[PDB]
């Protein structure tokens, strides 16, 4: 298994959601960054993981779950058996790292990508090692019920640049954003 990662947009007010969508209109091109991201290895013959709450699982378009090309975890105490179309379930965080850990999954997997939500992201930024984070900045507030925890800046260093990630400001639908990858090692 190779690296470990989280992917958030966030808008100004550090939203992340409302009422179990996003806090702001879709934005087509903002989804297709997050499925590129996310499915794209460095590695010939493996797929990447995605790991997200039950909330997020079900806050994705029906659609687009499971997420195509991914292994798809879900994170759960109360659910007795994955999601429908989804791969796995995992009761804890560690638990599903450690479950990368057996063998028939160990050389399947590249990237692991945490997709959601606020409480995944929470554990998985203030616990020791290696970790990026890809943020969207939605440069603008939005209501919200669910926000992105702080960055602490001073372990999180902003890259000046990461390959296959514009860095100029984006817009659609009159919303300007911008992308940023953070970078932990500690
Ligand atoms: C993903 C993505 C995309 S796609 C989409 C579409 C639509 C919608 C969505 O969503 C959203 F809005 F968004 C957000 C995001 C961003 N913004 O980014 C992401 C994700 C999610 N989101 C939102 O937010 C919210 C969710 O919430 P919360 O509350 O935070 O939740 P969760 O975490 O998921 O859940 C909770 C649950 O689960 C479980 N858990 C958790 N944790 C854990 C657990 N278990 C065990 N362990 C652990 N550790 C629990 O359960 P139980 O059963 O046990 O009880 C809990 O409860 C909402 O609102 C949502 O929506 F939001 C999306 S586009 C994009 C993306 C990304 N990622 N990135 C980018 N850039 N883009």
Known sequence: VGSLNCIVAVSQNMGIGKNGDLPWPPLRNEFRYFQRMTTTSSVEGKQNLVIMGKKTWFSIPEKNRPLKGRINLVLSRELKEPPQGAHFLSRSLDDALKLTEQPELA??????????????????????????????????????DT???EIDLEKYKLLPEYPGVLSDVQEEKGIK?????????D
Request: glycine share 6%; aromatic share 18%.
């Open 107 to 144: 050389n399947k997997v590249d990237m692991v990508w945490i997709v959601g939500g606020s409480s995944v992201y929470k554990e998985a930024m203030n616990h020791p090692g290696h970790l990026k984070l890809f943020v969207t900045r939605i440069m603008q507030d939005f209501e919200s």
């Open 177 to 185: 954003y911008k992308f940023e990858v953070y970078e932990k090692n």
């Open 147 to 149: 926000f992105f925890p």
